[PDB]
Amino acid sequence: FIGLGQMGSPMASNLLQVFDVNAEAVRHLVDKGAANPDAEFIITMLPNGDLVRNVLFGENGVCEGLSTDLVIDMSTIHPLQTDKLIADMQAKGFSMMDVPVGRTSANAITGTLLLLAGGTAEQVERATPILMAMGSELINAGGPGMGIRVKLINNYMSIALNALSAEAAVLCEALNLPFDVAVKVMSGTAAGKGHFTTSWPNKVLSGDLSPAFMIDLAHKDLGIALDVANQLHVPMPLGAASREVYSQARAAGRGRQDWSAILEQVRVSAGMTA
Amino acid sequence: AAIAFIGLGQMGSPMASNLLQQGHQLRVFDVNAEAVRHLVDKGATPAANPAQAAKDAEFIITMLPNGDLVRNVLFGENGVCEGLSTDALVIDMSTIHPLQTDKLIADMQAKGFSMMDVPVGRTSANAITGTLLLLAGGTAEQVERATPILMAMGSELINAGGPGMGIRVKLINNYMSIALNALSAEAAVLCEALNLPFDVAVKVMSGTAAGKGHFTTSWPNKVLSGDLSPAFMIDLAHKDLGIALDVANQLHVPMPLGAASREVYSQARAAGRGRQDWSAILEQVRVSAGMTAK
Amino acid sequence: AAIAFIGLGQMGSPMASNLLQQGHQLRVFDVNLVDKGATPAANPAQAAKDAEFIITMLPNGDLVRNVLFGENGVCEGLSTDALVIDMSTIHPLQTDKLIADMQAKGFSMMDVPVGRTSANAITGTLLLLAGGTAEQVERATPILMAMGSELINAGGPGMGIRVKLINNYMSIALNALSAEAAVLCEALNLPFDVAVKVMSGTAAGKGHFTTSWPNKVLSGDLSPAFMIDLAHKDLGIALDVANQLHVPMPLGAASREVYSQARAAGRGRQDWSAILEQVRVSAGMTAKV
Amino acid sequence: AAIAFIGLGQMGSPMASNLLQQGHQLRVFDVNAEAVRHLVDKGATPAANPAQAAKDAEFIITMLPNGDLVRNVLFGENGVCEGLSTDALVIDMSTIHPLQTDKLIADMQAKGFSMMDVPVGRTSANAITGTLLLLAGGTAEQVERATPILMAMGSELINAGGPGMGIRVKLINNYMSIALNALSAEAAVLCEALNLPFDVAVKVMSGTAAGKGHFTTSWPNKVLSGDLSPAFMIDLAHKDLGIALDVANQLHVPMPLGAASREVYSQARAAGRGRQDWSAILEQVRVSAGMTAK
Numbered sequence A: 001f002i003g004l005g006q007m008g009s010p011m012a013s014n015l016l017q018v019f020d021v022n023a024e025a026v027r028h029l030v031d032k033g034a035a036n037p038d039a040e041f042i043i044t045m046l047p048n049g050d051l052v053r054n055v056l057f058g059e060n061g062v063c064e065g066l067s068t069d070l071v072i073d074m075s076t077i078h079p080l081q082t083d084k085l086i087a088d089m090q091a092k093g094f095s096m097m098d099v100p101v102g103r104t105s106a107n108a109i110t111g112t113l114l115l116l117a118g119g120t121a122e123q124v125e126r127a128t129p130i131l132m133a134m135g136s137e138l139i140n141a142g143g144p145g146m147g148i149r150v151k152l153i154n155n156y157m158s159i160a161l162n163a164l165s166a167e168a169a170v171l172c173e174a175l176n177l178p179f180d181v182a183v184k185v186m187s188g189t190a191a192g193k194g195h196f197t198t199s200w201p202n203k204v205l206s207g208d209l210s211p212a213f214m215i216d217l218a219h220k221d222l223g224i225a226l227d228v229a230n231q232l233h234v235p236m237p238l239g240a241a242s243r244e245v246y247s248q249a250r251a252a253g254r255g256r257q258d259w260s261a262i263l264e265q266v267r268v269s270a271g272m273t274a
Numbered sequence B, D: 001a002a003i004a005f006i007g008l009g010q011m012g013s014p015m016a017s018n019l020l021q022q023g024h025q026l027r028v029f030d031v032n033a034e035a036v037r038h039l040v041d042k043g044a045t046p047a048a049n050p051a052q053a054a055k056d057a058e059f060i061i062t063m064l065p066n067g068d069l070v071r072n073v074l075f076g077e078n079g080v081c082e083g084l085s086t087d088a089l090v091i092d093m094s095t096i097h098p099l100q101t102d103k104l105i106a107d108m109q110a111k112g113f114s115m116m117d118v119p120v121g122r123t124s125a126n127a128i129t130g131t132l133l134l135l136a137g138g139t140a141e142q143v144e145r146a147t148p149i150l151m152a153m154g155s156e157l158i159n160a161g162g163p164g165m166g167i168r169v170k171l172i173n174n175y176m177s178i179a180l181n182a183l184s185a186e187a188a189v190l191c192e193a194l195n196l197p198f199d200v201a202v203k204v205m206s207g208t209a210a211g212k213g214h215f216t217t218s219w220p221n222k223v224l225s226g227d228l229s230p231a232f233m234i235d236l237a238h239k240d241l242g243i244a245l246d247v248a249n250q251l252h253v254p255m256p257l258g259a260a261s262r263e264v265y266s267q268a269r270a271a272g273r274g275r276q277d278w279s280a281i282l283e284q285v286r287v288s289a290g291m292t293a294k
Numbered sequence C: 001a002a003i004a005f006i007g008l009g010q011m012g013s014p015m016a017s018n019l020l021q022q023g024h025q026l027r028v029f030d031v032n033l034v035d036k037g038a039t040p041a042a043n044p045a046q047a048a049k050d051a052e053f054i055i056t057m058l059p060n061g062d063l064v065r066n067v068l069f070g071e072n073g074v075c076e077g078l079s080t081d082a083l084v085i086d087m088s089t090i091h092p093l094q095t096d097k098l099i100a101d102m103q104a105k106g107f108s109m110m111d112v113p114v115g116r117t118s119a120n121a122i123t124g125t126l127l128l129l130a131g132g133t134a135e136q137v138e139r140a141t142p143i144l145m146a147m148g149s150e151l152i153n154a155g156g157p158g159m160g161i162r163v164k165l166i167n168n169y170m171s172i173a174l175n176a177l178s179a180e181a182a183v184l185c186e187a188l189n190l191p192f193d194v195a196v197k198v199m200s201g202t203a204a205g206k207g208h209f210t211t212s213w214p215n216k217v218l219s220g221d222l223s224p225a226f227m228i229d230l231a232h233k234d235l236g237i238a239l240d241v242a243n244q245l246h247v248p249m250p251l252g253a254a255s256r257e258v259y260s261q262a263r264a265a266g267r268g269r270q271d272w273s274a275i276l277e278q279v280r281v282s283a284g285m286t287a288k289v
């Protein structure tokens, strides 16, 4: 176990049923059961992909003391950094898999993390028994580097959504609507349940852009929301940006398409095809 | 009961159709005569204008595209006001500006008339099957009076808890879902650009705040309880957002909402919230809007 | 000349005052100048009776319509020989509709909104942004030069409001961008005066309109002087630094996603002036180059 | 003088060409052998790698796309450090991350070598004519030593006032100019969508802060003098921005920078700045960045 941070410390604690630069962190794990990296499994849980590399390949690195018999990076790092590390370890005969975790440090404590299993379909079994104690659910990401990839998508979505949710909630407060009422409504719609499993499956994801809710009408409602926010001085940077995305969809002739067609617009914007 | 229905559009037409199916007597108006004709086939009496539609109706329903057309249908040349009785109840089910709704409810309360806001959640497919989400504003008395009529058009009613609270919860819901659609698109195209099957992303996000939202997950026992002690620190959220935007920018997936959201997290860091729970972003947006800190 | 003036606000009041000072005869109305020689009127209609020129200076295009076409409106008192001058800053499409709805009833209407502040309204040194026909601008110029010091022929009906909006959009948004650059400057402990000296030698301080654009994108030449890929990369460095120093840069952040869209569309090796072409395509216009 | 020049791109090539024209001896390296060949025709000595280029050079110039390629050219396999003397002066004229520059200047100061940052303002058109703006970081001694070499590539030099201050003022300049290009595009396309000739817009904007900028017009005697009394009120600026965004949204001209800018003005209004001069936006962005109000 390399890394005794907000996630590392409780994860290692659940295993006890070790190296870190902070001697106090070392001391806390010793009083629950190494100066640098004959173990079957190396787990790294470190803040960035540089520290992971410097802990595997640096002066007094893991590689110098590692056996030819899975290294599991559970860190949140750059996917391309993960790909290069898995290849640079595959180059020297060693096996490396990416198993980052979903959910927070509260779930790390209770061993109820979402385990986001990258690496080979075979390789998942080899580490799976060990890591299925540290989380409550495992998702087969379906290849090397797919673990960190689905972690990034999930974290992007949840972190940005928090900012958007804040704008909606303070506009709610500025309009003197109890938040409890907003939440009750939004829990029954895409607002609370998301579009991924509601508006998208039978429309854009099925290649059907025939309208259930038209982009023009969505665009118009966004205008009302931004007028209200601007008269009540609730800054809504995400709302403001989102209206200009809808505006781009209108410019491209998608005005009478279903709102799920925004997905197709962002695909075109990224230089993808239909 | 005797109902006037003005606005026979994608929503209006099947809503009015469900009222007739439930044995109500409808006077219908809309500028499109074909829309009028579809409801007349189904038993509605046609009216030449809003005034005629409103004559001796207990309930006046408007379903129109904006608050100006609602005003011009209530107060304009041959308006609802000209044919309305002081005993009737006006239900605007339109999505319009909440402050336009407040002014219309007051300008109808000024002339002895009763007006309530009952906008709807869900689409035209649900209007057809009478399974709309009914977002009932107006007084508890007005909601009780109107509920029997409303339950012919929708399968669920939510008491929004006052005049104008119906349109407000509609606006908050629609703001959230319309903007979220744009954010969801950024996540899905970054997913595709990284060659991750989308079904895998959705499976993962369905188990976290990404798919379940923050309102009922990260918020209740943290910021909404006045506890800002970190479960997930703003600085770490800020860092992960940076990685996402670096990747998107290397793969040329434009993420305007992500990019804006990082500058919100940056503002939270500048204000000393870096070691607070990510739910503290709510407190940052409240301060940013000139509200008193909780 | 015989003038009706409707709207005696922060701008209206001193503008009408300068018209009287220049020996014009004013009928004035406002919902809330007589000391200074104006005849008061009970409503727009009365104000308009036997006026050659009707001036409106109101906060929005709805109040302009309700003052021209409403109960006791200007149309009620206007002659077919008179000229309506809306000097209000309102929606351009609202101006177009008002000029047409007045041309429909035999009345003549031009847009002459004003640039510069209420200090300039007081001294009669406003920037006059003269829309309307060449004839209407000639006819109105003598009246207008009593309220402003400089007149710009916008070159048609509705072009007055349009050039006001474009100018004000550009300057108001630029203020926000300039702020981001200046605070990042301070966060890096670079004296501002040094940054300004440097930026005065580049498009940063001189702008792109008259520097990098004329001989590149505006000439249909997209061959690089400065490549979009490198511009995109520099924006990345700026946002990383700002994010480490907690200087929020919402305009920078948005701008990088615009450059990112230009890269997605295959413009990475084009000149940075090609961003104009990208925004034209984004707005559903036909590509020029 | 004996100069090593590594990076013969859109900037590098003509800069090195101007050094040869001024009778300096250049050892040139680039991964593109055709770029090497163009400067060899003009009198340059080709080198197989950075090391060879650096052997017995008084001045080492790097002009590369990013700070990683600069490091790999200075410290990599057959790097500049392998052929560099303790007597030479390394001048990175690249646009890279300021912290990457600080680390490179320190990692070269650690091995007895001298390194300074002299990035350039203006484009490759100015590189060709030797009229670059030279943004001289490093010590005043290093700037004096390098100035005669530098003045062959640029027409003016600005003493940025220390190591790493060259790249810092380059970043401020480049941030401003790159983002301004995006904003200028929004204004010009809204202009076209409204069927207003651009030349008319430019004539007007040339007489205001739109064309002249705020730094030297609206800011000096207001916010930069500590005076926030209005010439143009934030509320009025906020209103005009709203009209522009309504028009753009009706004509489907996407204006992401405009839309973001209005939310900045909105934050200024929430903070009580509505009746302050528009120059007070500077003070709002300072507060947003956690700086003390001036």
Ligand SMILES: NC(=O)c1ccc[n+]([C@@H]2O[C@H](COP(=O)([O-])OP(=O)(O)OC[C@H]3O[C@@H](n4cnc5c(N)ncnc54)[C@H](O)[C@@H]3O)[C@@H](O)[C@H]2O)c1
Residues within 6 Å of the ligand: C225, C226, C227, C230, C231, C234, D006, D007, D008, D009, D010, D011, D012, D029, D030, D031, D032, D035, D063, D064, D065, D066, D069, D072, D073, D093, D094, D095, D096, D120, D121, D122, D123, D124
């Ligand atoms: N283009 C401008 O207007 C301008 C002006 C001022 C500053 N800058 C900055 O100056 C730098 C150079 O810009 P440019 O316009 O010359 O770009 P460019 O891509 O035309 O020049 C880069 C050159 O470096 C070469 N190169 C890349 N990696 C190399 C390596 N490891 N070893 C040797 N050669 C290598 C490339 O082949 C190319 O010839 C960048 O940092 C840029 O942002 C650009």
Ligand SMILES: O=S(=O)(O)C[C@@H](O)CO
Residues within 6 Å of the ligand: A101, A102, A103, A104, A154, A155, A158, A159, B208, B209, B210, B232
């Ligand atoms: O993935 S989420 O649960 O939204 C965030 C948590 O994983 C913190 O890293």
Ligand SMILES: O=S(=O)(O)C[C@@H](O)CO
Residues within 6 Å of the ligand: C202, C203, C204, C226, D095, D120, D121, D122, D123, D173, D174, D177, D178
């Ligand atoms: O200095 S600017 O004219 O803003 C751009 C050019 O120098 C490229 O770096």
